[model samples]
Target: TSEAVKKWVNKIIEENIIAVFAKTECPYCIKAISILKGYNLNSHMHVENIEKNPDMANIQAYLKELTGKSSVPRIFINKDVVGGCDDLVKENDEGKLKERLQKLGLVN
Candidate 1:
């Protein structure tokens, strides 16, 4: 369980500039995805529905270790954990989300 979570986390960090750990049925996860789509960066971010995975609990525990939060919609930008849905909403509202994207060259 630990190994799988470690491997999954490692692979995602290596392969994606933006990663989202979520559950399909989570409203927060859906909100996060919708906001990304609004910014037209939905396709660029990797989304993982832990509920569909056999290792959901282990994976979520690992995510908590990585981000210090035990919630869905765990977002990472350029390998930095960006908290949850509320953080995303705040960043977007404050215009910081787009700024970060532009800095990462994810948007122009």
Candidate 2:
């Protein structure tokens, strides 16, 4: 049921320090991935490529309900929603992203 999907989404966010809910074919998703990979987070980064999931629709539905948008590249850091690609770019460009990662002991 949708309740189970909601729980699964919550669990993913809770378990990963850096979670990226993305689609493999989206350019924005690619950019977001590259940006986060630049930090060399390795296993700390959990990238769930929703396109590969059979439950992709359900996942996106839950994402929309949780974040107010159904778009891909939904990035979360330290259990906080960082919006999509543009939001990630803005945060990184402004140095806020690094600051948050540093606070979490993820990067120097």
Candidate 3:
């Protein structure tokens, strides 16, 4: 389980500039996705839903271990944990989100 989680985390987060552990039906996840869409990241941003996984309990547990929060819309930017939905909305409003993304070369 540990190795599988590690591999999954590496595959999703490291390989992509921005990765979101999210669910399609979650309103917070939708909000997070919409906020990210404003950045025009296109293929650089990716979302992985635990609902789609074969082992949801293990996946969510691993997500909690990896991110410190198990909720949907757990977001990472440039492999850095940006936190959950409210954190993202707050950061975006405060301009810190864009600032960090620009610094990381993920945004213009």
TM-score of each: 0.91, 0.93, 0.91
Q: What is the lDDT of residue 74 in candidate 1?
A: 92
Q: 32, model 1: CA deviation in Å?
A: 0.5
Q: Relative to the unseen true structure, what is the Cα RMSD of model 2?
A: 1.1
Instruction: Say what the RMSD of model 3 is.
Output: 1.3
Candidate 3 C-alpha lDDT tens digits along 1-91:
7688668867899888889888758999988888898898767988888788776677777778878977787888888889998999889
Shift in Å, residue 17, candidate 1? 1.3
Candidate 1 lDDT by residue in tens digits, 1-108: 588679987788668888888887889899888888787776677888888988888888888888898788899888887889999999999999999999988788
Best by TM-score: 2
- For candidate 3, what is the TM-score? 0.91
Off by over 4 Å in 1: none
In model 3, the worst 10-residue window by lDDT is 54-63
> Which has the higher lDDT value, candidate number 2 or candidate number 3?
2
Q: Residue 75 lDDT in model 1?
A: 91
